[PDB]
From Swiss-Prot, chains A, B:
Transmembrane segments: none annotated. One of its GO terms (biological process) is fatty acid biosynthetic process. The lineage of its organism: Eukaryota, Fungi, Dikarya, Ascomycota, Saccharomycotina. Gene3D superfamilies: Medium-chain alcohol dehydrogenases, catalytic domain, NAD(P)-binding Rossmann-like Domain. Its main location: mitochondrion. It catalyses: a 2,3-saturated acyl-[ACP] + NADP(+) = a (2E)-enoyl-[ACP] + NADPH + H(+); (2E,4E)-hexadienoyl-CoA + NADPH + H(+) = (4E)-hexenoyl-CoA + NADP(+); (2E)-hexenoyl-CoA + NADPH + H(+) = hexanoyl-CoA + NADP(+). Induction: Up-regulated by growth on oleic acid. Belongs to the zinc-containing alcohol dehydrogenase family. Quinone oxidoreductase subfamily. GO terms for molecular function: enoyl-[acyl-carrier-protein] reductase (NADPH) activity; trans-2-enoyl-CoA reductase (NADPH) activity. The gene is ETR1. Its EC number is 1.3.1.104. Keywords: Fatty acid biosynthesis, Fatty acid metabolism, Lipid biosynthesis, Lipid metabolism, Mitochondrion, NADP, Oxidoreductase, Transit peptide. It comes from Candida tropicalis. This is Enoyl-[acyl-carrier-protein] reductase 1, mitochondrial.
Amino acid sequence: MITAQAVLYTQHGEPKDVLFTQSFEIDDDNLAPNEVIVKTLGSPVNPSDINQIQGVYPSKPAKTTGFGTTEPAAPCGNEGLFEVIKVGSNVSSLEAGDWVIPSHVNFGTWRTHALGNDDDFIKLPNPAQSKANGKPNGLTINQGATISVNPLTAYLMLTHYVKLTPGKDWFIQNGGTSAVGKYASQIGKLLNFNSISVIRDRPNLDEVVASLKELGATQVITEDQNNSREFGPTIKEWIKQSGGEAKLALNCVGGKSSTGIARKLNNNGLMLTYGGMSFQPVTIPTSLYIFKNFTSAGFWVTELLKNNKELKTSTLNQIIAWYEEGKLTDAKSIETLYDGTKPLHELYQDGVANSKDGKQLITY
Amino acid sequence: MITAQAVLYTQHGEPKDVLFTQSFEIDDDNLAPNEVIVKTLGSPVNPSDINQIQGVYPSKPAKTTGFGTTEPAAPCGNEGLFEVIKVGSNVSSLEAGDWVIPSHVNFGTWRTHALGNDDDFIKLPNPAQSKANGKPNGLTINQGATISVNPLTAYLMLTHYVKLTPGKDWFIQNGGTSAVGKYASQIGKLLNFNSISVIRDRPNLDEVVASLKELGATQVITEDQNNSREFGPTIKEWIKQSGGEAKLALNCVGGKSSTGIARKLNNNGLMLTYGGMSFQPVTIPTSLYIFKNFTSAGFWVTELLKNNKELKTSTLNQIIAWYEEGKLTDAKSIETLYDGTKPLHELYQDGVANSKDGKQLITY
């Protein structure tokens, strides 16, 4: 028997008010033929995790007595890296020591262990396997724990909707320093797509600009530059010199920022909105729709892949390969190790409260 | 020889400042085999005609010395109804007395006569022909003169993009009392599509609502009601009871109104923006794009029908037939007859200045 800990809530609200830690047992000596028991290695705090707890997210884990609690309760977290510790008699796809991520959302990753079916997980190579197989690198725990949403989102937005001609065409995106923004710059570099990253100004602008260009952004401009009508000629010249067109805009800000990047696309452009800044609607001038054949659509990785495991598999495999090859890098998470000296839910509450410092990863 | 008058400009600007009238000759005794001479019956003043003259509309007639001017000059007007006066030796598609409209935009319709090739025109049945064909009605001069922009726009937005299930599905539109809005309500009724028209509140609201429902709007609400999610219950029920879904939103307003109609669509909805009320961008909540698979795109009949003669042909044919069959009605225009006592360009300048009074049609 294993004694596990899970972060739960019986009522929606701010994480700081409703979360608590529940101890529960998993019987590793009584596994059904297709069952698997995993131990969590690390799981991040993402905005969607927080929105589910707040009760304002379209998809949420069902409440249950499953973790034994006194009163219906729901688990937290959708992303995370786990390691198989034991499998049932009919399990062949997974073995002890294998690294896995959940195959579906609402898994409840803010906990120490989980019991599921082999098909509730997707295997990733662990460092030992990558190294034994001759790869230059193995995935880090943060890379594995955060591989399921952000890297796939950047890859899919850049390749699944419009075909950018290598060396010539451009995409433009705001939220340039976001996790997805940084993955998109790298994927653009790897696939030879030109790109303009728009970012908020900051005290260390030059350092940030150099960093994004090294990741792969062709040009980096501030939101002030994005707002400048007088800057239009420079952008047009960048595009003219490459012999391509700006065909795709990635928006995660809305408001004036979305207006600015939409205006920089050539005729027949597509904008994909995949995030938004708290109560800032996507704002597009009427003229772009009428005269520039502009289209504005959405992107939600969860919905896109729900019934396309193959597309998901192919995408995940490419991100895994690039990590092993040392061609892709993650932004570093601030890691907080759970050692039992502080309640697990408190580590996540601090994570939620400190999200402004950087991505928070609770490790085990 | 025929002496004709044309409204021209040598430089873009406001109609009241840049228009003038040029007298020019057409030699009706020297027609090439495929040429035809037409005499204008009527041509309207549309926003696009005005924007073209202002220099803020991207599709425009080239400035040429064709009218015998000292400097290159551009003609004005994109739609209009003409009567064929004489045809060349190799013309068989048209004969004297036939009614025609330009086959392409940028022809210049604010003038008394024109010389062109037979394929620069599309034949419409004249009243005598409709009568001889046993039809209950023939087209009026206003119906023929205004057939190529607004009716085609309403018809194509409703049929060319998303397929609404007859007797079940819905479209919602703002600008409900606009010319296109009124055509859309009628075409919706003919296609058996349910619809909600959103209009501005006004003094004789009950009368307006009744008139729009008679035209074909299933339900009519005001912008205040469109903004009141507290009124939103009344709308969700209408759709539920019908058994269909709201799949298409037609927007010509932007701003808060565009947000309101977008929110009323079911998942996988499409918004087409075909107009906008001065510097009021199309504003759509981020959540509709991400969680409701919402898409917003544009509509411009000029670009859609460029290089698509068959689509234009079949659409025009259906509108013509509907007028003949008494199934479609146009809003009445304020008609100003050109008798030669006042410069032609002045009649059009007055038409531009008085467009708020109603559609201005200059007749001959």
